[PDB]
Structures are given as C-alpha cells and as structure tokens.
A paper describes a structure:
Prokaryotic ImGPS enzymes (including the ImGPS from [name]) form heterodimeric bienzyme complexes that consist of the cyclase [name] and the glutaminase HisH subunit, which supplies ammonia by glutamine hydrolysis. The active site of [name] is located at the C-terminal face of the central β-barrel, where two conserved aspartate residues, D11 and D130, catalyze the cyclase reaction. Based on the conformation of the loop that connects strand β1 with helix α1 (loop1), these structures can be separated into an open conformation, where loop1 is flipped toward the outer α-helical barrel ring, a detached conformation, where loop1 is not visible in the electron density and presumably flexible and a closed conformation, where loop1 closes over the active site.
To assess whether the mutations have an influence on the conformation of loop1 we determined the structures of the [name]-G20P and [name]-F23A variants by X-ray crystallography. In summary, our crystallography, proteolysis, NMR, and simulation data demonstrate that the [name]-G20P and [name]-F23A variants have opposing effects on the conformation of loop1. Whereas the G20P and F23A substitutions decrease the kcat of wt-[name] by several orders of magnitude, the F38A substitution has no effect on the steady-state catalytic parameters. Instead, the G20P and F23A substitutions likely influence turnover via alterations in the closed conformation of loop1. In contrast, in the case of loop1 variants [name]-F23A and [name]-G20P, kobs, increased linearly with increasing concentrations of PrFAR, which is indicative of a simple binding process without involvement of conformational changes. The [name]-G20P and [name]-F23A variants on the other hand interact with the substrate via a one step binding mechanism as loop1 is, in those cases, unable to close properly over the substrate.
Numbering used by the authors: 1 to 253
Amino acid sequence: MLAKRIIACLDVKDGRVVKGSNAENLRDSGDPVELGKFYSEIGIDELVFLDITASVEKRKTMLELVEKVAEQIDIPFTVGGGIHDFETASELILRGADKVSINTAAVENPSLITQIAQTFGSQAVVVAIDAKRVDGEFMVFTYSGKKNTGILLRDWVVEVEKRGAGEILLTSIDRDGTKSGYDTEMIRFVRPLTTLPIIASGGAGKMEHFLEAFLAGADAALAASVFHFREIDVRELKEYLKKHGVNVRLEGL
C-alpha cells in the first residue's frame, strides 16, 4: 500500500529558518542545514522550505539554501514561496531541490506545471492549492490567500492532475496555524477528484489530527506549527499512527 508521510514545513526568511522557538538541543535552529538534518534523523519523511517573504533577494538566497541543504540532507525536500516561472523552478531543481511547489504561477499559467514535469519528471512538481469555503463552495485563492480566483477547487484539482503535477499540497488557509485540526472536509472533498498524492496542510495541533487527515484520504501530512513550536514528537506521532493502521515508515526511529 502507498506510504503515508510526515512532512515538516520550515518557513524561511533570508535563507534562514524563522526562529524564536528554542531548540536547546541544537546549536542554531535557524540554520536550514542543521535543522533539516535533525528532522531527517528523528523520523521526518520530507521537508518543505517555504520562503514566507517570497520577495526581495528571495531568488538568490533560496538558491544558496538549496545548494547547502541538498548536499547535507538525505530526505526529499520541496521549496516553495514565490516561484513565479519555469526558469526559477529549473534553477532550484538543478541545484538539488527534489521538488518545487508552485501555486499562483500555476493558476496563472497551468502549462507551467507540465513544463516542469516534462523536464524534471512529474514527481518534481508539487502544486500548492490554497482553498477556502466561500458560501458553501471550495474556491482556489492565490497571492497568499488574498485573491479569490473564482475557480472552484473541484475544477482546479482535476486540471492540475491533467497538467501532469506529481502531488497536490492542499492548504486550508482558514485552519492554517490554528492548531484546531486539519480541514478533513476539504481533504475528503479532494480525495475522489485526483489519483495524485495529497499533502494535507494547515491546522495540525495534536497527534489525533494527523490520524484524521490520513483517514480523510491524505497521503502526507504537512505541519509547521507543531514542529516549529516543538509541540509534537515525531517518533511518538508515527508510533501512534502505525498503531491505528496508517502506513507510516517506522524505519530509523
């Protein structure tokens, strides 16, 4: 059966991971190399490096992060945050990013998905879909959740797979950071619409939330807060999930 993955989202500013959380077991929890390597060693399956500024000097600083991270970590990582075009995605993958996450640029140019997939393989292209329920209908939002595109989530999911994406990173904006649970209604809504792996994102607060995301059909669970704020232990989480039938990888724990 398909693997079920636990993925940590590391928010990045100026090539460093947003700090303020005290990893007194680490020398510098702002270092993407040291932090990513640590997560790799404690059982995280993949990383996402999300540039949350996505703007000034982002291009160069993210390239340097990729160069340093790729040579030191042994689990896959995705980069995202303001990847606007094929050349930017290409540079990141060529420097060692395993995957790139595109969102606004994909909505505005869906064949960008296909271009990356054809050059680098579909597995290198993650389409991040940020959605909200708008008057009872799931809609796609771009520009960090500030633009309702008026595109129905249902239609965009189908198009994204048609365009050759390898995975969908499905973020419920309205649960993100709330620690209130993943948007399992959204996950369940998307599940029958695509055969692609769905990375659920936004809302994780406790181990049981991960179980619910997987029961809703997620193939991976992404979380920022619970790892950033050191609220959940990765090994304890995987043991609990495996006990409840979820096909997580316990190797190396």
